[PDB]
């Protein structure tokens, strides 16, 4: 008793049913895989800037 092995017949219609979802607008600015030396320098420059430092007083 053999049954079907494979079909992609209806798959493109199912994909378009609710549109093709775009990624989130925060995935474009993640620090997920950035060079660590660059990230460390960015942190220290912000903290020492009086106009953008969040340190209290």
């Amino acid at each position: 008793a053999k049954l079907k092995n494979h079909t992609s017949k209806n798959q493109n219609r199912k994909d378009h049913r609710n549109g093709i979802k775009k990624p989130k607008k925060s995935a474009y600015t993640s620090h997920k895989g950035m060079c660590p030396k660059y990230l460390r320098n960015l942190r220290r420059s912000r903290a020492n800037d009086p106009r953008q430092s969040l340190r209290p007083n």
Binding site: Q11, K14, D15, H16, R17, N18, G19, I20, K21, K22, P23, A27, Y28, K32, G33, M34, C35, Y38
Partner: protein, 153 residues
Amino acid sequence: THSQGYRCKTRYCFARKFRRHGMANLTTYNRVYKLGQYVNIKVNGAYHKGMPHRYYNGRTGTIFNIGPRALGVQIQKRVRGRIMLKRINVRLEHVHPSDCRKNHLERVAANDAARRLAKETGQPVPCLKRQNALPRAAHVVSIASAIDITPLK
């Protein structure tokens, strides 16, 4: 059979072009890249480190990471009914800068220049919008015509 090794079905896309074998020219190493720049992906088959998968050949993306020897490129990939953002590391032999924005940059520059020019002289500003080809206008042509006929079989 059906096996899906990392480099399956690459007999033609990874081969070198005709009479373009050997080492790459040195311009591929001393050009400057910046964060946010658009680049193209083209695999070079003579360089086996930092090589992307066959799927990414012929796609365009932006730079998110500048490394000591490799770049980080963001690419949009469709998977079923959804788009995923993929981040890959590529060596310099497989990446070229992209001219997908050059037309827009030149249009912006020209628009600003023309806006400046007419203001100083006060001339009216023309239309700075692209037009899709409009139908032709009225005109007059001369006749020195040649009779055309259908030939025998």
